[PDB]
Amino acid sequence: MQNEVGDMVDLYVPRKCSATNRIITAKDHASVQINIGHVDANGLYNGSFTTFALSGFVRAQGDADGSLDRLWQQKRAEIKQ
């Protein structure tokens, strides 16, 4: 939220679940953040990675595995990983 003067008025901008787009609250302790490392040719790990955060709701449902696998297929396609 921006003020009409042009300042941010929110304490913070919370993360959104990468699968359900739900806002990940500060006390959502079932939420996680996965960093999937990037590998170049020969299999060496570059040191860069992509990040996905899943809300506690999607993990509690059990769809976290399938959601994460679909998200990773998409980004891997896009970045050639």
């Binding site: 009409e4 304490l11 913070y12 990468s18 609250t25 960093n35 990040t51």
Partner: protein, 214 residues
């Protein structure tokens, strides 16, 4: 003085954190109250009520005392602690620690034109605990807090100037009344609004940020 027992406590002790919203971004559990004191110094403290609870025993009744404590900096952070103990003084002391441990961010918005600083709830928000349901409606600037005494105190510590409230159920149950109001304040950084439609950038968590220190 203080030996941190958690990884988060170690970083807070060293000074890797400056504000409590870095903890909020990653939804990390806060298990040491010294973290909240270090990062949120302008915290006040008020005992809302003391309640005697009795456990029937073979020889009379075993009376313990339940203390409800609200903390807050009046600038977007509020916390509620409930501790039951054999002594009132330790019941209050335990509830203050619990209240600090449950310090949650509170989102504040504008009833109309976004002029000045936020003063009300961004949107209609509701909290429920037991039979108590607490509704908070954004109010024009200058309205003040139109609420019962119990939710007014929590709203004052949250830093909310103007709000309309309505409650249903047994609000005479003060534990539920205060818990429902606190849940209502908590569910305020959780309503997705078009201003939060921008995709998250996923900054590094402090665990992986300071694995060299830890």
């Amino acid at each position: 003085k203080w030996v941190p027992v958690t990884k988060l406590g170690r970083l807070v002790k060293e000074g890797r954190f400056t504000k409590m919203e870095e903890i909020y971004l990653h939804s990390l559990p806060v298990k040491e109250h010294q973290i909240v004191e270090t990062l949120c110094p302008g915290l006040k403290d008020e005992v809302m009520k003391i309640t005697p609870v009795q456990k029937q025993t073979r020889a009379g009744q075993r009376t313990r005392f339940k203390a409800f404590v609200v903390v807050g900096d009046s600038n977007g952070h509020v916390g509620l602690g409930v501790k039951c103990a054999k002594e009132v003084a330790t019941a209050i002391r335990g509830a203050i620690i619990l209240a600090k441990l449950s310090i949650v961010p509170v989102r504040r918005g504008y009833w109309g034109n976004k002029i000045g600083l936020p003063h009300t709830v961004p949107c209609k928000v509701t909290g429920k605990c037991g039979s108590v349901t607490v509704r908070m409606v954004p109010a024009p600037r200058g309205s003040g807090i139109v609420a019962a005494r119990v939710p007014k105190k929590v709203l004052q510590f949250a830093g909310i100037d103007d709000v309309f409230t309505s409650s249903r159920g047994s609000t005479k149950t003060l534990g539920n009344f205060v818990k429902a109001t606190f849940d209502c304040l908590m569910k305020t950084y959780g309503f997705l609004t078009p201003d939060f439609w921008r995709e998250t950038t996923f900054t590094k968590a402090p665990y992986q940020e300071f694995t060299d220190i830890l």
